[PDB]
Amino acid sequence: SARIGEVKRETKETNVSVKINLDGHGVSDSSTGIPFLDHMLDQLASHGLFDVHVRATGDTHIDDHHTNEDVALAIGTALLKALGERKGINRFGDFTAPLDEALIHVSLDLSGRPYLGYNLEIPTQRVGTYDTQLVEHFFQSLVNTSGMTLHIRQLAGKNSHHIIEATFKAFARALRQATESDPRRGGTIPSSKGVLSRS
């Protein structure tokens, strides 16, 4: 059966609902209140083949920050739930994607241990109305609740939209690879220590 994770998360700042199918067909269904983020989440669906359902509202008159963070936190938890015990999966993903002059390498391990390595240098402060500092925060928050080791490396790029979008494409492909079935491992846990856990 398809691996589906669902999360609802409300604070005084934001209200978020997420449903992710790891075994999806690339259904894009994201409405966060942050249009640029929606476009990025569409890459996650289109290139990762995840079914991505996201709804969020929040205090965007203060900053897109809280919405951005809370969407990411909920996506991470949805991934954690969908992944379960992580039996039989590839576990590791590794992909470098361009978008024109931009080139972004993403490597990840569905380890249970959160870590973000990130070196993007996005040369403008706003892409549309979206604060480009929020890209790093999206990935940091997602790693923290998913229990993912994630490295994002900027190999080339100048246009801020190209840099960010190449990142989401590379991430989508790496995460697709990591979450997919390993055809040789016979459903075993892919760890020498016998378990993968966020604790």
Ligand X SMILES: O=P(O)(O)C[C@@H](O)Cn1cncn1
**Could you tell me how many helices (H) and strands (E) the chain has, helices first?**
4, 10
51 binds Mn ion, rule: CB under 5 A:
no
Contact pattern for Mn ion over residues 147 through 186, marking x by CB under 5 A? ------------------x---------------------
Contact 98, 186 (CB under 8 A): no
**SS3 sequence of 80-122:** HHHHCCCCCECCEEEEEEEECCEEEEEEEECCCCCEEEECCCC
Cα–Cα distance, 88 to 90 (Å, whole number)? 7
Q: Which of 69, 148, 160, 171 binds Mn ion (CB under 5 A)?
A: 69
Residue bearing tokens 């669906």: 45
- Sole binder of ligand X in the list 12, 61, 184, 193 (CB under 6 A): 193
Q: How far apart are CA 150 and CA 80, in angstroms?
A: 14
61 in contact with ligand X (CB under 6 A): no
> What's the closest the beta carbon of residue 72 comes to a copy of itself, in angstroms?
11
Decide if residue 87 touches a copy of itself (CB under 8 A).
Answer: no
Query: From the CB of 13, what's the least distance to Mn ion, in Å?
Result: 7
DSSP 1: -
Q: Is residue 2 a contact point for a copy of itself (CB under 8 A)?
A: no
Binding site residues, ligand X, CB under 6 A: 65-66, 69, 99, 111, 161, 165, 191-193
Binding site residues, Mn ion, CB under 5 A: 69, 165
